[PDB]
From a paper:
These O-glycanases display endo-β1,4-galactosidase activity and specifically target the polyLacNAc structures that comprise the main backbone of many mucin glycan chains. Overall these data reveal that the nine GH16 enzymes analysed are endo acting β1,4-galactosidases that display a preference for polyLacNAc structures found in mucins and other similar glycans such as KS.
Structures of BF4060 and BACCAC_02680E143Q were also obtained with the Galβ1,4GlcNAcβ1,3 Gal product present in the negative subsites (despite the latter enzyme being a catalytic mutant) to 3.3 and 2.0 Å. A cleft running along the concave surface of the enzymes contains the active site and where the trisaccharide product was bound in the cases of BF4060 and BACCAC_02680E143Q. Inspection of the BACCAC_02680E143Q and BF4060 structures with product reveal most of the interactions between enzyme and sugar are with the Gal at −1 and GlcNAc at −2. BF4060 and BACCAC_02680E143Q have four fingers and BACCAC_03717 and Amuc_0724 have five out of six possible fingers that have been observed previously in other GH16 structures. BF4060 and BACCAC_02680 display 79% identity and unsurprisingly the structures of these two enzymes are almost identical in the cleft region. BF4060 (and also its close homologue BACCAC_02680) has a significant preference for TriLacNAc over milk oligosaccharides and analysis of the +1 subsite shows a narrow slot where a GlcNAc would insert with the N-acetyl pointing away from the cleft and S174 from Finger 5 would pincer the N-acetyl against finger 6, thus generating specificity for GlcNAc over glucose. BF4060, BACCAC_02680 and BACCAC_03717 also displayed some very weak activity against laminarin.
Numbering used by the authors: 36 to 276
The structure:
Amino acid sequence: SVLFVDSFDGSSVVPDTAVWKLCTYANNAWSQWFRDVNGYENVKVEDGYLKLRACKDNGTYKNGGVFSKIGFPCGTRLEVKARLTKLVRGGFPAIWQMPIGAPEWPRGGEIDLMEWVQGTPLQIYQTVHTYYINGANGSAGVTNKNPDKNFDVTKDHVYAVERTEKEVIFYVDGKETWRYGNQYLDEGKLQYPFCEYPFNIILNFSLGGELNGRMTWSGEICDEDLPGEMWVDWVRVVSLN
Ligand SMILES: CC(=O)N[C@H]1[C@H](O[C@@H]2[C@@H](O)[C@H](O)O[C@H](CO)[C@@H]2O)O[C@H](CO)[C@@H](O[C@@H]2O[C@H](CO)[C@H](O)[C@H](O)[C@H]2O)[C@@H]1O
């Protein structure tokens, strides 16, 4: 019941400009190293994978990411099949959704199908962020309390979420990993906003490191290990029947 799908096996060498835009500078951890990325230099399509890359070109760090113009409502499931080429110390690869036309983050929500941090190398993080949860100034999220801690991010896996009016469910290789639930409170507390906007698709490989001279989460960057790609074999959204 297939709503949208990219298997990156097109005529073309870069993800279809109809659907996909490139991530851009922002004074936060993931977005920092977008500033000064010359066009599509960290993003290509090649034997059927979207290949997102992180390098340090001449002194200065470069992230590789795109996101969808288009969003999707509740009653969908998102599926992203991806590996990392290698564990990169300071890597910060991300498969996530984000709301289009939401009041300022986090109010309208954020959903993370996969993120990776050098600190817990044998584990990924499936995480949900709201206003209710974080604060505004907070950005901790709520991750699987009881996750998989012998995981190999460098094999292909299929990262995945369901959004219903009722709740957000995460999967990995098609096993449920855990869920966050609408509690149906005073809609004011913005406890569960994940259906009030459409949520998009954001694929990136960012470098972490220092930020305004305070170290971020993905921790210290090791140049030795650069570059590193994340390959998205494909991306699929499915209405539920
Ligand atoms: C703490 C932080 O960096 N927050 C930004 C947010 O976050 C990410 C994490 O919370 C999560 O783990 O997923 C990825 C993994 O790489 C991020 O690190 O991302 C949003 C959207 O880009 C940010 O927001 C935007 O900020 C700008 C101002 O710079 C703008 O004002 C806009 O309203 C807001 O959406 C977080 O800063």
